[PDB]
Amino acid sequence: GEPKWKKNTLTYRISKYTPSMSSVEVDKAVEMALQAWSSAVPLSFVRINSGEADIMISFENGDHGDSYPFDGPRGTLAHAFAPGEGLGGDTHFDNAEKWTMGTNGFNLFTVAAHEFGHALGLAHSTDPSALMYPTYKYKNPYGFHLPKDDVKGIQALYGP
Template identity: 50%
Template sequence: MQLAVLCAVCLLPGSLALPLPPEAGGMSEPQWEQVQSYLKIFYPYDSKTRDANSLRAKLKEMQKFFHLPITGILNSDIIKIIQKPRCGVPDVAEYSLFPNRPKWTSKVVTYRIITYTRDLPRFKVNQLVEKAFAMWSKEIPLQFKKIKTGIADIMIGFARGAHGDGSPFDGPGNILAHAFSPAPRLGGDAHFDEDERWTDGTSIGINFLFAVTHELGHSLGLGHSPDPKAVMYPTYEDRDAKDFKLSQDDIEGIQDLYGKRRD
């Protein structure tokens, strides 16, 4: 009889669920699981750090990056941030794709658009990519040359789900795009999630110019900026397209890598 009662209790849903840790801040279990996944992707553990496996330490790191009160405890401000669409590149400076300040050594960097989105005409995608490159080249002594065939330094394309680089897209929302720092093969390449609705700013959707300018910053060697006004800020913000330009933080970052343009 006692064994039967015990078995019945064990089968009750949630009866043996472990309480959430203090770092959860009283949030729900789905929210806590969501933030753990977010931290794993965008604030990966550094084995050299003493408390590398501490979620509290990772929460503090995220709070510091986004200029939030550093408590190490989950709150509604963090929930709002993780629910925003964003770039798929991690925020931490120790990210493995950006060791030793990689940059292009050639003064002429080639690029090629290998796949297009169905949301925009090809000529419009070409125009916006060219405009994004022009924003960066205005500040540094690099020239960008488009090629139509062969392997370019920076390969640009749209894809869905798994697309051969080990970083699959996740469907509409959340991760919009990602890019790799200067290097052979995948290095410099920029990929955009075709499951998003892409726009040139004349309709509802993700403004492709904003996204491609950001990703090309990664393609040139920049990491994420904690400055909300910067193009290299990790989350997507819908801005006024007429006023869209590199911030002083973006300019100082890219010139720190390549120097100033001298016409």
């Protein structure tokens, strides 16, 4: 089959955060990114209290048990896993740089919707308006959900 998901009710658990934002502000920053995908297809992300989730999220510095480490004060803001089970679906954020709700540091919202996109089964599209754009592409954080092609993409994974 395809390596993407066999169910539409996915699980999530946090284990770490950025210093620049509080835990509630980071949950509140991702909530907007979850909804965008739950607008493109009938899926949902259910936050757990007891069991290693489909999607586990953490902040890590350089080597972290991936042959692809973090890179420090620029470049890779966030690297997600592809869909799977174990490391699969788990999304990793860089602790060597700076996060916020604005343009100076890294907009956790603008970064997050793209990385959730990878834990689904999607790839870097590079399309002049797409969300999986490999460059930290600046979308207006005002109901913008996905641009377009990212919607036809996720429809192919969970089923229309």
